[PDB]
From a paper:
Here, we describe the design, characterization, and application of de novo helical hairpins that heterodimerize to form 4-helix bundles in cells. Starting from a rationally designed homodimer, we construct a library of helical hairpins and identify complementary pairs using bimolecular fluorescence complementation in E. coli. We characterize some of the pairs using biophysics and X-ray crystallography to confirm heterodimeric 4-helix bundles.
As a starting scaffold, we aimed to design a helical hairpin that homodimerized to form a 4HB. CC-HP1.0 was soluble in aqueous buffer, and circular dichroism (CD) spectroscopy showed that it formed a stable helical assembly without an accessible thermal unfolding transition. By analytical ultracentrifugation (AUC), CC-HP1.0 formed a monodisperse dimer. To explore this through modeling, we generated AlphaFold259−61 models using the CC-HP1.0 sequence. These predicted dimers of hairpins with the syn arrangement, i.e., as designed but in contrast to the anti-arrangement observed in the crystal structure.
Author numbering:
A (entry chain A), B (entry chain A): 1 to 49
């Protein structure tokens, strides 16, 4: 369900980070970092719900 | 480098979440949520560094 969709976004983000590791800079990294934090907040809400 | 190692942990976490979506419960989910937050904090530090 919604967790299946979130696992997809997390697999997409791991791929962003694999690419980022060959083309790094602060902006993109702190960008992906905040993407993970948003997904973690959604997961937390599903845990509470 | 260290970013290559982190991309590996993120691909591992996406796999945890894919499995979790068929066997969910609050503990494990809030567990994985805090795992993402720790990885995001490491990424942020690399961005700053």
């Amino acid at each position: 369900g919604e967790l299946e969709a979130l696992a997809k976004k997390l697999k997409a983000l791991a791929w962003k980070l694999k690419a980022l590791s060959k083309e790094p800079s602060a902006q993109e990294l702190e960008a992906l970092a905040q993407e993970l934090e948003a997904l973690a907040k959604k997961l937390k809400a599903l845990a509470q719900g």
